[PDB]
From Swiss-Prot:
Changing residue 55 to T: In MCOPCB10; dramatic reduction in retinol binding; has greater affinity for the STRA6 receptor. It comes from Homo sapiens (Human). The lineage of its organism: Eukaryota, Metazoa, Chordata, Craniata, Vertebrata. Detected in blood plasma and in urine (at protein level). Gene3D superfamilies: 2.40.128.20. Changing residue 57 to T: In MCOPCB10; dramatic reduction in retinol binding; has greater affinity for the STRA6 receptor. This is Retinol-binding protein 4. Retinol-binding protein that mediates retinol transport in blood plasma. Delivers retinol from the liver stores to the peripheral tissues. Transfers the bound all-trans retinol to STRA6, that then facilitates retinol transport across the cell membrane.
Amino acid sequence: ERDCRVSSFRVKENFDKARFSGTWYAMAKKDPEGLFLQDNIVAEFSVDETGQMSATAKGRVRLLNNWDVCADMVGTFTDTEDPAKFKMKYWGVASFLQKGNDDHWIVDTDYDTYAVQYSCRLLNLDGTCADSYSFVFSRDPNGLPPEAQKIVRQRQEELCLARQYRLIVHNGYC
């Protein structure tokens, strides 16, 4: 029944930045081709007076051949016609870490407990994603409440990414 084509994905109606700001702990990730950001990923989102969102991040990274650092990132959200969809230009502090420009969309959030972010870097000829990534976000490093857990799972399914995610640990690396 449900569609798997990008342009169909729902997003957070009336997305509010302000409300969003703050610390978010990554509980689950759905890796894209060429994984970066391993685990212990904590993100600190903000917005300045203009209405411009931005954020930093931090987590383990597994460089080539086993060499794991504690990266520190920087993103800067470029709006779009739709409130929940942003163009995110990111880069790390160390000129050697990864740089890019990725679509960042807020699929769903309640602002105070969980969030579900989505990103599709390369579409297929059929409209489905050929290279995507997801983040389940939790305002608490211990998990979300059974109630939040439920919509979140509902959400992972609407993105046709269910049971594709993987638990994100916070064992204290960073």
